[PDB]
Enzyme design. Structure first.
Site, mmCIF file in Angstrom:
data_model
loop_
_atom_site.group_PDB
_atom_site.id
_atom_site.type_symbol
_atom_site.label_atom_id
_atom_site.label_comp_id
_atom_site.label_asym_id
_atom_site.label_seq_id
_atom_site.Cartn_x
_atom_site.Cartn_y
_atom_site.Cartn_z
ATOM 1 N N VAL A 51 0.833 -1.193 0.000
ATOM 2 C CA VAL A 51 0.000 0.000 0.000
ATOM 3 C C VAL A 51 0.862 1.234 0.000
ATOM 4 O O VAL A 51 1.841 1.309 0.750
ATOM 5 C CB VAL A 51 -1.057 -0.032 1.143
ATOM 6 C CG1 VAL A 51 -1.843 1.270 1.241
ATOM 7 C CG2 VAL A 51 -2.015 -1.207 0.952
ATOM 8 N N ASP A 154 -13.357 -9.479 7.879
ATOM 9 C CA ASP A 154 -12.071 -9.053 8.434
ATOM 10 C C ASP A 154 -12.241 -7.746 9.204
ATOM 11 O O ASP A 154 -11.408 -6.827 9.114
ATOM 12 C CB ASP A 154 -10.981 -8.962 7.341
ATOM 13 C CG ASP A 154 -9.565 -8.926 7.898
ATOM 14 O OD1 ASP A 154 -9.350 -9.446 9.027
ATOM 15 O OD2 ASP A 154 -8.655 -8.464 7.171
HETATM 16 C C1 54G Z 1 -7.607 3.680 1.980
HETATM 17 C C2 54G Z 1 -6.971 2.348 2.267
HETATM 18 C C3 54G Z 1 -5.761 2.264 2.947
HETATM 19 C C4 54G Z 1 -5.115 1.053 3.123
HETATM 20 C C5 54G Z 1 -5.673 -0.116 2.625
HETATM 21 O O1 54G Z 1 -5.010 -1.287 2.850
HETATM 22 C C6 54G Z 1 -6.917 -0.070 1.971
HETATM 23 C C7 54G Z 1 -7.557 -1.333 1.485
HETATM 24 O O2 54G Z 1 -6.979 -2.404 1.550
HETATM 25 O O3 54G Z 1 -8.746 -1.193 0.984
HETATM 26 C C8 54G Z 1 -7.539 1.172 1.794
#
Ligand code: 54G
Length: 327
Positions: A51, A154
């Protein structure tokens, strides 16, 4: 063998919809332009993705990019379909785009920006009013996705992104989410240890939306009692023993009897015999300002072994615990 089970709400939502809605394998991904996004910094790496904070150079807006690892294929398509079905829903993270990452050669999901702060950073320091306020906001996300025939699977503090200054919340990481189909047996290897429902721990596969309500109860118990986590298991087996030390073994054996479940024999030497503890046992001078009769009654109705007996998300929103929250 085991007795079957069905959700008591939103049972047949997917059955009536065209296959286009839930048949995620037949979905055709509409690819965006990867050059619209400039990666700024790495925020984290989990089991299935990396991420990043990024900038959408076509409007200078901040975004989040999740680059999927090339492990599973059916799993990727399921997450995209779920995110598109839920887009615009209350407190649901907004999928802005899907691009092919030039380096990894895998899909990269682009989300609307949220503050780089998860609920785990704030939830042990909130006031009584803010616990109620934020739990009501999470419930809006859960009733919406359940009404749409989707279970998150989750729910945990890391998957709730909060902007405390703006009193805004988003439910994120839909990578384990699934379409609920009555009578379907699901994989019990979902959710994080401390938030796993008894149905997962006793290997009961015909579970439903109510799994998210147990995980929500674990989060509430950790907040009102200032105990992180509330059920502190050493592994998946001790996780059930920690639950049984609170809820008692008699209601556990009644649950297993009702669904005709074969309890793993590994439990015979570790479960012991325990009576249900009254919720006041967990109250002390450091958390008493977060506890009320309404908080305990609400928690009691979420933390039930029998998944069919837990409050649904809409029933939870009706509870007296939320009468104080401005609506
Ligand atoms: C905005 C956001 C930040 C980190 C993340 O892991 C996700 C997601 O997996 O949907 C979304």
């Amino acid at each position: 063998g085991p007795v079957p089970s069905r959700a008591r709400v939103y049972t047949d939502v997917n059955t009536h919809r065209p296959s286009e809605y839930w048949d995620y394998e037949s979905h055709v991904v509409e690819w965006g332009n990867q050059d619209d996004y400039q990666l700024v910094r790495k925020l984290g790496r989990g089991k299935y993705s990396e991420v990043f904070e990024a900038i959408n150079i076509t409007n200078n807006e901040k975004v989040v990019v999740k680059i999927l690892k090339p492990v599973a294929a059916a799993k990727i398509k399921r997450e995209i379909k779920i995110l598109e079905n839920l887009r615009g829903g209350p407190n649901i993270i907004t999928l802005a785009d899907i691009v092919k990452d030039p380096v990894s050669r895998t899909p990269a999901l682009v989300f609307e920006h949220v503050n780089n702060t998860d609920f785990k950073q704030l939830y042990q320091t909130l006031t009584d009013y803010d616990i109620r306020f934020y739990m009501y906001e999470i419930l809006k996300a859960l009733d919406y996705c359940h009404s749409m025939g989707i279970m998150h699977r989750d729910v945990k503090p890391h998957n709730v992104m909060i902007d405390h200054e703006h009193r805004k919340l988003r439910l994120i990481d839909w990578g384990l989410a699934e379409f609920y189909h009555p009578g379907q047996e699901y994989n019990v290897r979902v959710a994080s240890r401390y938030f796993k429902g008894p149905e997962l721990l006793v290997d009961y596969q015909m579970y439903d939306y109510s799994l998210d309500m147990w995980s929500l109860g674990c989060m509430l118990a950790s907040m009102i009692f200032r105990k992180e986590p509330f059920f502190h298991g050493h592994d998946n087996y001790d996780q059930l023993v920690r639950i049984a030390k609170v809820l008692g073994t008699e209601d556990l054996y009644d649950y297993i009897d009702k669904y005709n479940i074969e309890l793993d024999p590994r439990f015979n030497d570790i479960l012991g015999r325990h009576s249900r503890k009254r919720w006041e046992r967990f109250v002390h001078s450091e958390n008493q300002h977060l506890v009320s009769p309404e908080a305990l009654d609400f928690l009691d109705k979420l933390l039930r072994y029998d998944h069919q007996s837990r409050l649904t998300a809409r029933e939870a929103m009706e509870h007296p615990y939320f009468y104080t929250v401005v609506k």
